[PDB]
Swiss-Prot record, chains A, B, C:
Gene assigned in the entry: VP1
Origin superkingdom: Viruses
Full protein stretch here: 630 to 735 of 735
Name of the protein in question: Capsid protein VP1
Compartments where located: Virion; Host nucleus, Host nucleolus
Organism: Adeno-associated virus 2 (isolate Srivastava/1982)
Other observations noted: The ratio at which VP1, VP2 and VP3 proteins are synthesized in vivo is about 1:1:10, which is the same as in the mature virus particle.
Length: 106, 106, 106
């Protein structure tokens, strides 16, 4: 049960966190009406969210002699630096980065 | 006093280790001669040498966002692998490798 | 490593203190949009800042007989007093003041 899109299969994954604004009714009628409220004060919410994850690492213990392939930035000059913002302050991710750079014997 | 060729300047560097074969005189004359010995048994020595050095590391503590330049092997196919032996078993070092790949602010 | 512009060279100088206003998003769309927020409530902040520095003094211990040069205000009358505000309440510093007025032997 490893996900086909990639990742860790969890029988009990991190739970869904559901958030919504409590409806605030607008001005009601002075006469009682059994119809459910359909007029509300327009509102939204803003705030900060923090996620902290602890990860366990499996340290490489290779005994190969020659150097390995490593992910690296390209030294040549460029208009924009990779994984930074441009003159519009727009953050971009130039390429997908996997994890399989070190080598291990079968 | 940093060496100009590169490295660590030491007022008391690792001492020189001097080794030589003890001269074994060849067959002497049965009559005493005050002349110093000039005939010796031809000989050499072979053995194993072990050097173990402990190095202290200064761990990188960078806060840059985008990836850094790292030394890496080239993925493209080649006749010979870098820093290995060839079909003659001759070890070669294809290029000089420095140490200055990570970055730190001034 | 004394700064060429003048002052004290510090390997660990007083740290930079960074302050910014937390962005408060404006009214969002009732339909989900994956585009990052570009509309915010215009706002600024005001407040008070306090800096307290303790300085150590090296007391003069001279044995010269005749009086020394000292920095002084000029007694003659003037339209404006030095290092005060003018009729517009604008504070000005009329001249640069150094620190080298007392004398010591070589």
């Amino acid at each position: 049960p490893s996900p086909l899109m990639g990742g860790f299969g969890l029988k009990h994954p991190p739970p869904q966190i559901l958030i919504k604004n409590t409806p605030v009714p607008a001005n009601p009628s002075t006469t009682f009406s059994a119809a459910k409220f359909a007029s509300f004060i327009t509102q939204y919410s803003t705030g900060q969210v923090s996620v902290e994850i602890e990860w366990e690492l499996q340290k490489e213990n290779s005994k190969r002699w020659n150097p390995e392939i490593q992910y690296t930035s390209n030294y040549n000059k460029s208009i924009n630096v990779d994984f930074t913002v441009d003159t519009n302050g727009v953050y971009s991710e130039p390429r997908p980065i996997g994890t399989r750079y070190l080598t291990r014997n079968l």
